[PDB]
Amino acid sequence: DKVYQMKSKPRGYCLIINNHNFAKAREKVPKLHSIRDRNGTHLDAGALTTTFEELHFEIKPHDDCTVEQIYEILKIYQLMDHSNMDCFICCILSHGDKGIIYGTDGQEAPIYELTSQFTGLKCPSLAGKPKVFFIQACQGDNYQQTRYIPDEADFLLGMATVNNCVSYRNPAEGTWYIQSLCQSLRERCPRGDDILTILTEVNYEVSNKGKQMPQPTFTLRKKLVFPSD
């Protein structure tokens, strides 16, 4: 019957890794030659920015990151002092495939390698606090194995799609998943709805518009809410 403490100001950092420019995925990595630049991802980054600033998080945007950069950014957050924070959010917008996300330079980063950097042992100042990841990306090429996060408690990963499949991005409106997620958080958090309940609503909205099926994976052990001013 408990809820994660969510009262500090700011609540925590909301890292946003936004990948748009995939030139090298065609200039340095032979197989993604037809990989299109992610038009519309900027609207997504802006929606996430305004959604979470309203929810009192400190936004830390980073655009066009190669896999090496993603790792160094994540490493800096792993080492930071979160002792005065109640939560940590990391959003990753990019191209992807089965269980992984692509850096702009076409290199790969297994989602599990990213999330597991924040276990209690590795990032003590977030031990016992919710670590939330939102990833907009494809997870294969099927259109209609990894377990993504550690088994220890307090992780929430919101994926735009089940593994092996794609997710859609409307160049003029943003991605289906991120746009739906932000709209629901903005409308529902002020009403006291918990984040998992919100994600089920997102599963529903996105699945109603091929079809796309989002999928939360998590080890949360308390109700998660983002109290809205």
């Binding site: 194995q145 377990r147 408690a153 609503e201 699945s207 079809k211 099926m213 999928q215 052990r221 109700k223």
Partner: protein, 212 residues
């Protein structure tokens, strides 16, 4: 106006089949009693080999009867790996959990399309076709089985108690509190006695295991 906007219909009698596969055999009648009380038709198979598991799951996935039921539940207890189960077989490459998913997907298993398919797995270690699935994976150390007075799964027993006493609450609401309880139990024991709980799902509606 609440969310989710819709609720999975839960009217059929029985609510569905509750397929229990306990390869270890230490669980008590507790979970079976609870699901029967909820309105499920329980069918139990003990000490199956991986082949036995693939074969029983495959079979159950094609049961024409699903057409008359509103949901399906499977409880799986077995030694296994990170994301697979070994059954009673002495092997290191088990039946991966994603294959179990493949067998119940909208295309493969049409009689359960659009219906909630729930999997509660106690592993002991050392419409879109992928919609409406609910996976609950608890991993605990095999050494919990190597005791002179083996203990039944605290995870399965807690799941049963919550469902038995609060069946009208959303399944996920109940499971988050179950996770909190496992976390409290874990805070008292070393890693080889802990119950880790991981969840993944593609539910699109409110899900309560009680007559709508």
């Amino acid at each position: 106006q609440s969310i989710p906007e819709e609720r999975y219909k839960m009217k059929s009698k029985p609510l569905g089949i509750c397929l229990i596969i306990d390869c270890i055999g230490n669980e008590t009648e507790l979970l079976r009693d609870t699901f029967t009380s909820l309105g499920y038709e329980v069918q139990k198979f003990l000490h199956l080999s991986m082949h036995g598991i693939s074969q029983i799951l495959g079979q159950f996935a094609c049961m024409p009867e699903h057409r008359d039921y509103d949901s399906f539940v499977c409880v799986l207890v077995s030694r296994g790996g990170s994301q697979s189960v070994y059954g009673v077989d002495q092997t290191h490459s088990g039946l991966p959990l994603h294959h179990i998913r493949r067998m119940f997907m909208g295309d493969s298993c049409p009689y359960l399309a659009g219906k909630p398919k729930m999997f509660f797995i106690q592993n002991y270690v050392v419409v879109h076709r992928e919609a409406d699935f609910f996976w609950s994976l608890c991993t605990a150390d095999m050494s919990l089985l190597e005791q002179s007075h083996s203990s039944p799964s605290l995870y399965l027993q807690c799941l049963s108690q919550k469902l038995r006493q609060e069946r009208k609450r959303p399944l996920l609401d109940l499971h988050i509190e179950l996770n909190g309880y496992m976390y409290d139990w874990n805070s008292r024991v070393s890693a080889k006695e802990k119950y880790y709980v991981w969840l993944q799902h593609t539910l699109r509606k409110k899900l309560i295991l009680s007559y709508t």
